[PDB]
Amino acid sequence: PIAQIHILEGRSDEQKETLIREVSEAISRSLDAPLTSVRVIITEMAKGHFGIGGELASKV
Amino acid sequence: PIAQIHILEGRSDEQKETLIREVSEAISRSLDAPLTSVRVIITEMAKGHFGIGGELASKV
Amino acid sequence: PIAQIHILEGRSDEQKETLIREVSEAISRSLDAPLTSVRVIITEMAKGHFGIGGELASKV
Amino acid sequence: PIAQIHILEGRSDEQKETLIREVSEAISRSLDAPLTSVRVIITEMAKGHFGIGGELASKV
Amino acid sequence: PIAQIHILEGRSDEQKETLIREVSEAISRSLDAPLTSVRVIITEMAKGHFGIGGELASKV
Amino acid sequence: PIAQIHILEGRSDEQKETLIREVSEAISRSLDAPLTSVRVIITEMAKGHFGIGGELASKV
Q1: Chain E nearest C-alpha distance from B34 (Å)
Q2: Which of A7, B35, D44, E19 has its CA at 20 to 30 Å from residue F29's CA atom?
Q3: What pathway does the UniProt record associate with this protein (chains A, B, C, D, E, F)?
């Protein structure tokens, strides 16, 4: 399995390291797939590159 | 956060329902973000639409 | 520009044809780019393949 | 609906703010979905990271 | 490396098997990366799910 | 066809230019599609933004 997660910029390296492990376990657990087959890709978004309802996430 | 997970076709609706919840908790837990803000998208791949090392996963 | 839109399954061919044109104009208008350079990809999600807050979009 | 748009780097914050709103309206209008449910993600590409016909968009 | 290719529906399993191998070699060759590290995902688009210049690829 | 390739940061502009051409030929060759219709997008990942088996690609 290959997961790509889009998150807003601002998290520390620790938090992202945890996200990668926790999500990787959840995927492995749920599908009963070997953990080593899981690939996770984090993609950070600038606060002004993410809109919700037509407006920047930053202003809301 | 928005997660998109690519998995091979073949799982039951239950398994995918669990994957969505387990992964959603892991993301919420790891980043300390409200669960309700997590979005997960499952995308199934046909066995002959996924290659590893230049060969179909179906053959490996 | 290349746009990929994820929508829930259930819409008619007409609605999707309109979505593709309307969005294509909006992109061309906003960035002052030639309409012919805009590429749009629609990706439908099964109701049980989309989760919000850890739950299927279908049951909520 | 969740839209991810890939555009070449070089636009101002204003232009991108407009792109996000215009496209968000177009999606909401076309599918008759509540504007607040629309999510847009902008992803900029470096001029040397986008190819057309096997050649950099920068040189063509 | 992880490649995701969007193609129009209509190709045979043979053609897609060739696409996966050929593209996998090209990536491995160009970056001097071990072939076994290359991952390719094929994603088919319905003819009415792909627009060019605001119009279905199907009718044009 | 539209291809998006995720690679780890660290390659030179030459290598990426070659990746774009080689991959563009492979796609055009395999599907018998006009080279000029092929679109390639390169997306670099920071070493600490890519996980394999729950661990950073950098540390393993």
Answers
A1: 30
A2: D44
A3: Xenobiotic degradation; toluene degradation; Xenobiotic degradation; xylene degradation
Which residues have CB under 8 Å from C57's CB, separation 6+?
C8, C47, C50, C51
Question: Would you state the structure tokens that stand for residue E29, as one six-digit string?
Answer: 């060759």
| C52 neighbors C8 (Cβ within 8 angstroms) | no
The residue assigned the tokens 């239950």 is: B14
Instruction: Specify the experimental method.
Output: X-ray
Nearest to E27 by CA among C9, A8, F6: F6
Chain E contact partners (≥3 CB pairs within 8 A):
A, B, C, F
Residues 6+ apart with CB under 8 A from B7: A1, A31, B19, B42, B43, B44, B45
Neighbouring residues of F12: CB distance < 8 A, sequence distance ≥ 6:
none
Resolution (angstroms) stands at 2.8
CATH fold, domain B1-60, is Macrophage Migration Inhibitory Factor (3.30.429)
What is the number of residues in chain F?
60
Q: Alpha-carbon distance F10 to F13, whole Å?
A: 10
F52 at A interface, C-beta within 8 A: yes
Distance CA A49, CA D42 (A): 5
The tokens describing A2, both together, are 């290959």
